[PDB]
Design a protein around this motif. Structure first.
Motif, PDB file in Angstrom:
ATOM      1  N   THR A  81      83.989  61.553  92.326  1.00 54.67           N
ATOM      2  CA  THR A  81      83.205  60.740  93.275  1.00 54.67           C
ATOM      3  C   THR A  81      83.500  61.252  94.732  1.00 54.67           C
ATOM      4  OG1 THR A  81      84.997  59.042  93.189  1.00 54.67           O
ATOM      5  CG2 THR A  81      83.052  58.669  91.763  1.00 54.67           C
ATOM      6  N   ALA A  82      82.913  62.406  95.058  1.00 54.71           N
ATOM      7  CA  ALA A  82      83.094  63.097  96.352  1.00 54.71           C
ATOM      8  C   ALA A  82      82.655  62.250  97.594  1.00 54.71           C
ATOM      9  CB  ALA A  82      82.335  64.437  96.334  1.00 54.71           C
ATOM     10  N   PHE A  83      82.789  62.869  98.777  1.00 55.74           N
ATOM     11  CA  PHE A  83      82.468  62.281 100.114  1.00 55.74           C
ATOM     12  C   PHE A  83      81.726  63.380 100.985  1.00 55.74           C
ATOM     13  CE2 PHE A  83      82.632  60.465 104.220  1.00 55.74           C
ATOM     14  CZ  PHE A  83      83.598  61.035 105.092  1.00 55.74           C
ATOM     15  N   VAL A  84      80.971  62.954 102.007  1.00 52.73           N
ATOM     16  CA  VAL A  84      80.228  63.891 102.913  1.00 52.73           C
ATOM     17  C   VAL A  84      80.487  63.529 104.423  1.00 52.73           C
ATOM     18  CG1 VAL A  84      77.933  64.626 103.778  1.00 52.73           C
ATOM     19  CG2 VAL A  84      78.349  64.455 101.290  1.00 52.73           C
ATOM     20  N   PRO A  85      80.889  64.530 105.235  1.00 48.94           N
ATOM     21  CA  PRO A  85      81.163  64.319 106.668  1.00 48.94           C
ATOM     22  C   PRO A  85      79.900  64.384 107.586  1.00 48.94           C
ATOM     23  CG  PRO A  85      82.610  66.028 105.640  1.00 48.94           C
ATOM     24  CD  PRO A  85      81.362  65.861 104.802  1.00 48.94           C
ATOM     25  N   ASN A  86      80.104  64.031 108.858  1.00 44.79           N
ATOM     26  CA  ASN A  86      79.076  64.071 109.921  1.00 44.79           C
ATOM     27  C   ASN A  86      77.975  62.976 109.792  1.00 44.79           C
ATOM     28  OD1 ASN A  86      80.375  66.531 110.878  1.00 44.79           O
ATOM     29  ND2 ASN A  86      79.269  67.619 109.242  1.00 44.79           N
ATOM     30  N   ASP A  87      77.244  62.787 110.894  1.00 42.93           N
ATOM     31  CA  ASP A  87      76.155  61.797 110.989  1.00 42.93           C
ATOM     32  C   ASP A  87      74.931  62.275 110.158  1.00 42.93           C
ATOM     33  OD1 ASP A  87      74.116  60.343 113.734  1.00 42.93           O
ATOM     34  OD2 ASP A  87      74.477  59.698 111.669  1.00 42.93           O
ATOM     35  N   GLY A  88      74.413  61.368 109.329  1.00 42.39           N
ATOM     36  CA  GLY A  88      73.270  61.686 108.494  1.00 42.39           C
ATOM     37  C   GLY A  88      73.670  62.659 107.402  1.00 42.39           C
ATOM     38  N   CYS A  89      73.223  63.907 107.540  1.00 48.21           N
ATOM     39  CA  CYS A  89      73.522  64.983 106.574  1.00 48.21           C
ATOM     40  C   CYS A  89      72.705  64.755 105.282  1.00 48.21           C
ATOM     41  CB  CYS A  89      75.019  65.005 106.234  1.00 48.21           C
ATOM     42  SG  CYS A  89      76.098  65.030 107.686  1.00 48.21           S
ATOM     43  N   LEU A  90      72.790  63.533 104.755  1.00 48.43           N
ATOM     44  CA  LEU A  90      72.085  63.135 103.534  1.00 48.43           C
ATOM     45  C   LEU A  90      70.553  63.319 103.746  1.00 48.43           C
ATOM     46  CD1 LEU A  90      74.912  62.267 102.785  1.00 48.43           C
ATOM     47  CD2 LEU A  90      74.056  59.927 102.281  1.00 48.43           C
ATOM     48  N   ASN A  91      70.147  63.473 105.007  1.00 43.41           N
ATOM     49  CA  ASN A  91      68.736  63.695 105.351  1.00 43.41           C
ATOM     50  C   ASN A  91      68.358  65.137 104.894  1.00 43.41           C
ATOM     51  OD1 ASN A  91      68.031  61.212 106.844  1.00 43.41           O
ATOM     52  ND2 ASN A  91      69.446  61.958 108.437  1.00 43.41           N
ATOM     53  N   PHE A  92      69.359  66.020 104.914  1.00 39.71           N
ATOM     54  CA  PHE A  92      69.197  67.428 104.519  1.00 39.71           C
ATOM     55  C   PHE A  92      70.201  67.788 103.357  1.00 39.71           C
ATOM     56  CE2 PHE A  92      67.279  68.022 108.973  1.00 39.71           C
ATOM     57  CZ  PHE A  92      66.028  68.552 108.548  1.00 39.71           C
ATOM     58  N   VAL A  93      70.568  66.799 102.541  1.00 36.85           N
ATOM     59  CA  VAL A  93      71.472  67.046 101.406  1.00 36.85           C
ATOM     60  C   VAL A  93      70.619  67.125 100.110  1.00 36.85           C
ATOM     61  CG1 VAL A  93      73.260  66.094  99.913  1.00 36.85           C
ATOM     62  CG2 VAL A  93      73.532  66.007 102.383  1.00 36.85           C
ATOM     63  N   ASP A  94      70.039  65.992  99.707  1.00 43.36           N
ATOM     64  CA  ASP A  94      69.171  65.915  98.511  1.00 43.36           C
ATOM     65  C   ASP A  94      69.982  66.142  97.194  1.00 43.36           C
ATOM     66  OD1 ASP A  94      66.466  65.553  99.808  1.00 43.36           O
ATOM     67  OD2 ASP A  94      66.853  67.562 100.626  1.00 43.36           O
ATOM     68  N   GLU A  95      69.835  65.196  96.270  1.00 36.11           N
ATOM     69  CA  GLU A  95      70.531  65.249  94.981  1.00 36.11           C
ATOM     70  C   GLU A  95      70.139  66.543  94.224  1.00 36.11           C
ATOM     71  OE1 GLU A  95      68.937  61.552  93.253  1.00 36.11           O
ATOM     72  OE2 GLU A  95      70.873  60.574  93.629  1.00 36.11           O
ATOM     73  N   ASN A  96      71.030  66.965  93.327  1.00 37.70           N
ATOM     74  CA  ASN A  96      70.828  68.137  92.469  1.00 37.70           C
ATOM     75  C   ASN A  96      70.791  69.455  93.285  1.00 37.70           C
ATOM     76  OD1 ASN A  96      70.267  66.006  90.431  1.00 37.70           O
ATOM     77  ND2 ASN A  96      68.270  65.873  91.487  1.00 37.70           N
ATOM     78  N   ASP A  97      71.615  69.520  94.333  1.00 38.74           N
ATOM     79  CA  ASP A  97      71.717  70.725  95.176  1.00 38.74           C
ATOM     80  C   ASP A  97      73.139  71.372  94.957  1.00 38.74           C
ATOM     81  OD1 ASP A  97      69.384  69.210  96.391  1.00 38.74           O
ATOM     82  OD2 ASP A  97      69.484  70.806  97.897  1.00 38.74           O
ATOM     83  N   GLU A  98      73.299  72.647  95.331  1.00 39.25           N
ATOM     84  CA  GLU A  98      74.601  73.348  95.182  1.00 39.25           C
ATOM     85  C   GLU A  98      75.629  72.700  96.153  1.00 39.25           C
ATOM     86  OE1 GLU A  98      75.742  77.263  97.128  1.00 39.25           O
ATOM     87  OE2 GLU A  98      75.643  78.026  95.070  1.00 39.25           O
ATOM     88  N   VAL A  99      76.912  72.806  95.820  1.00 47.78           N
ATOM     89  CA  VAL A  99      77.948  72.232  96.669  1.00 47.78           C
ATOM     90  C   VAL A  99      79.263  73.049  96.550  1.00 47.78           C
ATOM     91  CG1 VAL A  99      77.158  69.840  96.885  1.00 47.78           C
ATOM     92  CG2 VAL A  99      78.264  70.596  94.775  1.00 47.78           C
ATOM     93  N   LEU A 100      80.207  72.711  97.432  1.00 51.27           N
ATOM     94  CA  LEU A 100      81.559  73.311  97.511  1.00 51.27           C
ATOM     95  C   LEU A 100      82.476  72.202  98.143  1.00 51.27           C
ATOM     96  CD1 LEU A 100      83.797  74.750  99.535  1.00 51.27           C
ATOM     97  CD2 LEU A 100      83.487  75.704  97.183  1.00 51.27           C
ATOM     98  N   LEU A 101      83.408  71.673  97.351  1.00 51.20           N
ATOM     99  CA  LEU A 101      84.265  70.587  97.831  1.00 51.20           C
ATOM    100  C   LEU A 101      85.733  71.032  98.023  1.00 51.20           C
ATOM    101  CD1 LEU A 101      82.921  67.993  95.239  1.00 51.20           C
ATOM    102  CD2 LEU A 101      81.948  68.538  97.528  1.00 51.20           C
ATOM    103  N   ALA A 102      86.507  70.124  98.620  1.00 50.10           N
ATOM    104  CA  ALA A 102      87.935  70.331  98.902  1.00 50.10           C
ATOM    105  C   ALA A 102      88.640  68.940  98.967  1.00 50.10           C
ATOM    106  CB  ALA A 102      88.114  71.078 100.242  1.00 50.10           C
ATOM    107  N   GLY A 103      89.894  68.949  99.433  1.00 51.38           N
ATOM    108  CA  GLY A 103      90.680  67.720  99.526  1.00 51.38           C
ATOM    109  C   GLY A 103      90.751  67.036 100.886  1.00 51.38           C
TER     110      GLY A 103
END
Lengths: 324, 60, 67, 185, 144
Positions: E83-105
RNA sequence: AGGACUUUUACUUUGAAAAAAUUAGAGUGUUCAAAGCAGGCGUAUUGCUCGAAUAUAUUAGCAUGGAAUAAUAGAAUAGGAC
RNA sequence: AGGAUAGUGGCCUACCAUGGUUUCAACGGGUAACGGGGAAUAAGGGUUCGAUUCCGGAGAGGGAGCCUGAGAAACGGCUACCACAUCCAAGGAAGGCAGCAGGCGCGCAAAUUACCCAAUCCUAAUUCAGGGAGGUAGUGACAAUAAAUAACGAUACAGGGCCCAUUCGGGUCUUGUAAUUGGAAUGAGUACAAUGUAAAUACCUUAACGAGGAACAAUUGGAGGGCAAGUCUGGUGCCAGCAGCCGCGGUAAUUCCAGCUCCAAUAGCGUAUAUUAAAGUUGUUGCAGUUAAAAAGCUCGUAGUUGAACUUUGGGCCCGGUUGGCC
């Protein structure tokens, strides 16, 4: 091979190059702005051969060609000009547009998401086929004709997602609303017998409900300036016009809650509870948990028990929903 | 806990902020030329000393 | 300018020990050259399959072409 | 498969990140010695420590020991051939002492400014870099050349660039052609 | 005396005793058992690419009030639930489900960054373009 | 030294034992520096010479010394030393 | 005892004894395990790492077998199985890139199917042949070292020295900010030629072009504290989000997002994870156990750890080395 796919387009002017800098003028791109612009570098070029291809590094104006590598940057169908001052070409025609429609799921829900990339894969397999979401948690699939969609369904079937799929007609939703006004004043208090609530609901003008969905009335507009626009143009009461309380649901819905009490010195103490509970309400309506559209609220006289300890969110929200 | 949170408000700030560009600011020295600018005002020209010592203030 | 000179007793002993590149860089001999290394390695193994001169085998292929 | 080109770092950042005191003295050093990178001052203290260290280790050993003498004396006589260490103090105790100021007071930059030449200290750096000055004639564009004294009297505009002969500047030749092009026939 | 037997022939004795009480050490356990290469969503690895599945609206634990905007994902190298997290204001406006990702701690070695409940992995790249580029508008997201 | 039987170990001493590259580190102006191991000087018109050190090289093992220390053994129906 | 082996030996085979290993942790299991040299970190003491430029070791898709030969259990040798996988005219055939490039896949992640034997060495009958070992160039921000983005005049002009002052102060030492300006100083580049090289581009050389803010422009992060550096402005109103922890916003936020100014470091800074110091938060050095986490309920008793004193000690002589006055 590897999962990459060369674009297919005709040269209208200029000679193509293996690694040429060109600008993508997407279907919404316009020279005077910057939206849908993508000046990227092609990896190389290729000439068609029925089912297979061969690496041709250059091609002249008027002669159709293939620009491979620019796949993961374009917008399915678009203009590719290295000339910035260039206007946007004519945006096709087709004359068909989405009309057929179904719903897709799995026989095994543990690999369900593999089915969704099969859906995005179909977009990247046909031209006029359009896959999208429904306002009821289903993946509506639309297209040209019934067979069209079925071949596109045979695609999603064996190829793309390649797993068991459940197909059903697109499950609709019919915006719960009102014909008349609340016959009398509805009454309701906390489960902890005390603080009551009084209101009545009325039919809002779609002229203004659509004005919500067109930027005229915003849940955060000028109660003074927007009052002039809804009193002179929309014939409403400029009194409660500045007394608007919330847009339910999602915080911008076609439904609004309005202040009308006088002798309640402590009304503002329960507003947060009201606005969020008003949301849970315009979310799942009594009839059959269907969102509301053009549904107004006139909060008449609401009594609140002495201290705000019993007049708190934990028990007001359950009352409001029931009063509404 | 709450999974289905409303996301129709996300980005509010970086959306209606008064679009104010960057005013014409003359180039500043980079590298060694910098320590020159710093050192000449940080020590050679110095600043105030209200009580003990200060640095970057405000308009008053 | 730290260089490195070589004064041979004779010009004869020059085209004896003196490596090609130096004397060729000057212009003593003519630009001696063979095909590129890629042509040379490829040509090397093609001749490694064929046994002997075997021009009767090239003539043997001149047989499949008439039969 | 060739062989190790043995790398190693010359500087060493502090076990602290923003210690008020330490930062104020080192900025005044970039105005007295016209430097730009703490790394340039760190580098000094690092070599200063390696020195101070071996000095200490040798300093502990039993006096009269071949090592305390070999490694010691030979060492001292080097920091001296570079003019950093004082002649008078030859008991590697002024070395233990010292300070960045001293090791930094023997750089090509500090001497290029002190031996007049480029007037201001920084203007001294502006030239070292713009190809000027030399050793026995071995020009240098290394402001941190480490003047070692036995090369302090040879410091002067090398046979290259003006102020030492040779052909002046291209803007001067352009100024000559720009002078005869304006008014001439 | 007081504890440890200060003996000349009790080497291995003081050894065993030592290795033993080494197991009571937090970070020592995580190593002498490969807690990372087994449970840790990023099994012995640093970052990791995956696939965005849902645009969660994770709540904030006391005493702060507001929704955080996290994302539950199925990693490519495991598929295990994170159950990851996303930084910065908005972002989800240009994220969209089922897209590539790269996570960390969250420099926590597990643990939650704070107010965000359980979330142990935040985003860095998406579609192979990264936030900054789309957060400073130095490029637009591809056809990813 | 052909020869005869000898209290042992542990501890400690110097050397030795070793593949270097790496560590510390000699020296030496790669234009400076991590480097590198080069050079420096002459009749620069038929050459002279200094280098490319030493140590740590750790545990066990080997050789001399020490005899403090931890032990250890020796003559009792005398299993006695001379 | 023999056999087999280059050769010792349960290496193997007969016949015989009952034995050998084990709390000084065998055996079994895990290893995100090639070992060793050595790397990272450092006050000492330790800790963690070491696939990887070298060394000994092991394997060439997973095996087992074996020809030759001094040497192989080779596989850029072969035979068979298994897994594979490619050619076909359909009867058959061939093949392992954990060698150099390169392609897919796998991925957080890793370069060109370019040149060449000139160096280094090897192999060969053997100076001449050959070597995708190796050498070079390309790509390259894994580390490492040096350092460009300008500096001096300078004019309007206040500050702090002064010989000078009723008070009409010149000007006298200069410190800079200067929207007046002034020329030299230039490698980053570009380009004759040469140098370099096996050939060439680049390092080093150098004609001719090449610096005046619109340049030839340096950024990444941060400014409550911790941790150096704003309570300043505009929107935000416990929303958006920041927040490495503590903690910011609920309409005047030093912590949001943009302005402005400014700071820590600098071609590197921020990120994450890993490991060290911190950490005396792993302890022989060097911890704690009455209440903080912790003395077994009590004693016996192994193994282990460990254990009183007592054995020529002491006195005398002489000499050879190295410090210093000293004479």
């Amino acid at each position: 091979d590897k999962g990459r796919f060369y674009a297919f387009g005709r040269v209208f002017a200029g000679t193509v190059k293996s690694g040429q800098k060109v600008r993508i003028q997407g279907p919404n791109y316009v020279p005077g702005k910057k939206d849908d612009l993508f000046i990227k570098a092609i990896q190389r070029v290729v000439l068609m051969m029925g089912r297979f291809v061969e690496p041709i590094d250059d091609c002249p104006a008027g002669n159709i060609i293939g620009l491979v590598g620019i796949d993961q940057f374009l917008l399915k169908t678009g203009t590719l000009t290295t000339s910035e001052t260039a206007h946007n070409m004519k945006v096709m025609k087709f004359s068909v547009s989405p009309v057929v429609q179904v719903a897709v799921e799995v026989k095994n829900a543990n690999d369900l998401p593999k089915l969704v990339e099969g859906l995005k894969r179909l977009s990247k397999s046909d031209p006029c086929v359009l896959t999208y979401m429904s306002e009821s948690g289903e993946h509506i699939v639309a297209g040209t004709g019934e067979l069209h969609l079925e071949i596109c369904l045979q695609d999603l079937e064996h190829d793309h997602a390649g797993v068991p799929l459940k197909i059903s007609p697109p499950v609709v939703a019919y915006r719960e609303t009102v014909e008349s006004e609340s016959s009398q004043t509805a009454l309701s208090k906390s489960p902890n017998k005390h603080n009551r609530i009084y209101l009545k609901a009325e039919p809002i003008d779609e002229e203004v409900s659509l004005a919500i969905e067109n930027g005229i009335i915003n849940p955060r507009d000028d109660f003074k300036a927007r009052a002039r626009i809804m009193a002179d143009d929309y014939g409403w009461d400029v009194t409660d016009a500045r007394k608007i309380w919330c847009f339910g649901p999602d915080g911008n819905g076609p439904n609004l809650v309005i202040d009308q009490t006088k002798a309640v010195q402590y009304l503002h103490e329960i507003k947060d509870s009201v606005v969020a509970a008003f949301q849970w309400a315009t979310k799942e309506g009594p009839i059959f948990g269907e969102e509301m559209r053009s549904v107004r609220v006139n909060i008449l006289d609401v009594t609140l028990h002495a201290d705000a300890i019993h007049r708190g969110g934990g028990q007001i929200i359950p009352t409001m929903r029931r009063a509404t | 806990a709450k999974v289905h949170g409303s996301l129709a408000r996300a980005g509010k700030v970086k959306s209606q902020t008064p679009k104010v560009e960057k005013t014409e600011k003359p180039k500043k020295p980079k590298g060694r030329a910098y320590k020159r600018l710093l050192y000449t005002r940080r020590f050679v020209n110095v600043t105030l000393v209200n009580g003990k010592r200060r640095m970057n203030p405000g308009p008053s | 300018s730290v260089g490195f000179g070589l004064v041979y007793n004779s010009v004869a002993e020059a085209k004896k020990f003196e490596p090609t590149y130096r004397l060729v860089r000057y212009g003593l001999a003519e630009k001696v050259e063979k095909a590129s290394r890629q042509q040379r390695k490829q040509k090397k193994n093609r001749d490694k399959k064929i046994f002997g001169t075997g021009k009767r085998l090239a003539k043997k292929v001149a047989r499949r072409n008439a039969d | 498969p060739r062989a190790p080109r043995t790398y190693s770092k010359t500087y060493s950042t502090p076990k602290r990140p923003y210690e008020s005191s330490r930062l104020d003295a080192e900025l005044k050093l970039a105005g007295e010695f016209g430097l730009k990178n703490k790394k340039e001052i760190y580098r000094i203290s690092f070599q200063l420590s390696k020195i101070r260290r071996a000095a200490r280790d040798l300093l502990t050993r039993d006096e009269k020991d071949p090592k305390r003498l070999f490694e010691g004396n030979a060492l001292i006589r080097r920091l001296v051939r570079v003019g950093v260490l004082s002649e008078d103090k030859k008991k590697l105790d002024y070395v233990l002492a010292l300070k960045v100021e001293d090791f930094l007071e023997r750089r090509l930059q500090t001497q290029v400014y002190k031996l007049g030449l480029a007037k201001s200290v920084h203007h001294a750096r502006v030239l070292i870099t713009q190809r000027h000055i030399a050793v026995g004639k071995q020009i240098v564009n290394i402001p941190s050349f480490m003047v070692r004294l036995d090369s302090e009297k040879h410091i002067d505009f090398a046979p290259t660039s003006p102020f030492g002969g040779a052909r002046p500047g291209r803007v001067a030749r352009r100024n000559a052609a720009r002078k005869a092009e304006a008014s001439g026939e | 005396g007081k504890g440890k037997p200060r003996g000349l022939n009790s080497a291995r004795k003081l050894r065993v005793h030592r290795r033993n009480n080494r197991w009571a050490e937090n970070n020592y356990k995580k190593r002498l058992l490969g807690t990372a290469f087994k449970s840790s969503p990023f099994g012995g690895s640093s970052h990791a690419k995956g696939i965005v599945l849902e645009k969660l609206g994770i709540e904030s634990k006391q005493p702060n009030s507001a929704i955080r905007k996290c994302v539950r994902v199925q990693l490519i190298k495991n598929g295990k639930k994170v159950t990851a997290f996303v930084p910065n204001d908005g972002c989800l406006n240009f994220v969209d489900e089922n897209d590539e990702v790269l996570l960390a701690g969250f420099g926590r070695k597990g643990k939650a960054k704070g107010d965000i409940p359980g979330v142990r992995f935040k985003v860095v790249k998406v579609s192979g373009v990264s936030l900054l580029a789309l957060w400073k508008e130095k490029k637009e997201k591809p056809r990813s």
